[PDB]
Design a protein around this ligand. Structure first.
Ligand SMILES: COc1cc(Cc2cnc(N)nc2N)cc(OC)c1OCCNC(=O)c1ccc(C(=O)O)c(-c2c3ccc(=[N+](C)C)cc-3oc3cc(N(C)C)ccc23)c1
Ligand SMILES: NC(=O)C1=CN([C@@H]2O[C@H](COP(=O)(O)OP(=O)(O)OC[C@H]3O[C@@H](n4cnc5c(N)ncnc54)[C@H](OP(=O)(O)O)[C@@H]3O)[C@@H](O)[C@H]2O)C=CC1
Ligand SMILES: [Mg+2]
Ligand SMILES: [Mg+2]
Ligand SMILES: [Mg+2]
Length: 159
């Protein structure tokens, strides 16, 4: 069922002023590879930050208020969000901080990008207990012409 995918800078920073405080196209490529052809659930702030439907994925947006874009599916609770996914091999929760906090107890997999950048944030990833998770995949990358920081990809499975 349920996986979280997120990019974390130092001290678990994920956001500032409704954007990610870095520019790493390599992370966005990894995000696309790991979410294409799967339903994605996101909070209203994250939907507004992205500003457009993500192609090739059913887009499900959480909000307490009526929906404002007929191109995507709007739901008023976590229960309704999961129901909107139907029966699929894997549901991807794609942010932001408030949505991660509610779905982390339900998640069996974490797809994490660890970014070597010290940046200010106003939103953090929830503090998960590392003893509850087994790292099943990791991959390290240096900065390059397109990616100003080094970063590492990791997949954790719930023990
Ligand atoms: C899928 O996307 C997103 C996914 C997620 C969830 C998510 C992500 N990851 C992981 N792991 N888990 C997750 N759950 C969250 C998102 O947001 C919260 C998000 O949205 C990001 C959208 N992408 C960019 O915004 C983006 C990415 C790369 C670039 C880039 O520079 O290449 C640019 C870019 C600019 C960025 C900032 C800027 N200024 C500040 C002035 C000016 C820019 O000018 C440009 C001019 C160009 N041209 C053609 C001239 C071309 C590009 C740019 C923009
Ligand atoms: N990997 C990364 O680094 C990522 C970072 N981000 C960043 O995260 C930040 C956004 O996170 P955050 O501010 O916590 O906001 P969220 O994106 O988590 O959206 C929160 C909103 O979602 C709606 N919502 C949440 N839970 C529920 C529920 N149970 N029922 C109904 N509606 C619900 C509410 O909308 P309403 O007010 O309409 O009721 C709420 O205000 C941004 O800075 C963004 O750039 C986002 C994605 C990935
Ligand atoms: Mg804009
Ligand atoms: Mg990731
Ligand atoms: Mg600081």
């Amino acid at each position: 069922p349920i996986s979280l995918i997120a990019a974390l800078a130092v001290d678990r920073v994920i956001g500032m002023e409704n954007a990610m405080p870095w520019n790493l196209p390599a992370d966005l490529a990894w995000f696309k590879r790991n979410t294409l052809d799967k339903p994605v659930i996101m909070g209203r702030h994250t939907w507004e930050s992205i500003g457009r439907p993500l192609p090739g994925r059913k887009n499900i947006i959480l909000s307490s208020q009526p929906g404002t874009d007929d191109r995507v599916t709007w739901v008023k609770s976590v229960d309704e969000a999961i129901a909107a996914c139907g029966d699929v091999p894997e549901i991807m929760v794609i942010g932001g901080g408030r949505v991660y906090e509610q779905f982390l107890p339900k998640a069996q997999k974490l797809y994490l990008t660890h970014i070597d950048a010290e940046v200010e944030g106003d939103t953090h990833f929830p503090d998960y207990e590392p003893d509850d998770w087994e790292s099943v995949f990791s991959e390290f990358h240096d900065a390059d012409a397109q990616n100003s920081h080094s970063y590492c990809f990791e997949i954790l499975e719930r023990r």
